[PDB]
Design a protein around this ligand. Structure first.
Ligand SMILES: [Zn+2]
Ligand SMILES: [Zn+2]
Lengths: 167, 6
């Protein structure tokens, strides 16, 4: 007696429907890009909009126990990376003057490890913000053809892949 | 999954 799907249409017993387990609405398989045989291979179904919302909220949901452990393993893999040599530790002040003269929010993997250890981060977005802060500081301070900058590029690319499927 | 077929 009701209207279903993104296409707002009443039930048609001759059409293949699948139910979203998040929103409990029903969708034509043809409208959300899943056929019956593909549907047979999955336990829960999640509709495209609901799925978008889940993808978007991964960076915003509270960090759990396992998430924190995961962040520790991520930093470890980053610390072991060959192009991670410039980011392992804070810049030695009595070594690079103008570094702290122009960078007022430095970040480094050791400091990030400390922040993870004491649960300074509560959302994945905060952790990602600090990692990005490392690479952007670097790219702001160094020329784009320099090894420092390019190292920032390489490790950021590695990082983005390592983060996939995290939550 | 939860479906309705013909
Ligand atoms: Zn849904
Ligand atoms: Zn439809």
């Amino acid at each position: 007696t009701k209207l279903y799907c993104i296409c707002k249409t009443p039930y048609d017993e001759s059409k293949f429907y699948i139910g979203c387990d998040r929103c409990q609405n029903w969708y034509h398989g043809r409208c959300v890009g899943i056929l019956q045989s593909e549907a047979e291979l999955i336990d829960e179904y999640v509709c495209p909009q609901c799925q978008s919302t889940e993808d978007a909220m991964t960076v915003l949901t509270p960090l759990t126990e396992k998430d924190y452990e995961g962040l520790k393993r991520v930093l470890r893999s980053l610390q072991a990376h060959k192009m991670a040599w410039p980011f392992l530790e804070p810049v030695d002040p009595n070594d690079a003057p103008d570094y702290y003269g122009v960078i007022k929010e430095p970040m480094d993997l050791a400091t990030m490890e400390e922040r993870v250890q004491r649960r300074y981060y509560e959302k994945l977005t905060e952790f990602v913000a600090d990692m990005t802060k490392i690479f952007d500081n670097c790219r702001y301070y160094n020329p784009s053809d320099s090894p420092f900058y390019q190292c920032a590029e390489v490790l950021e690319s590695f990082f983005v892949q390592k983060l996939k499927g995290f939550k | 999954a939860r479906t309705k077929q013909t």
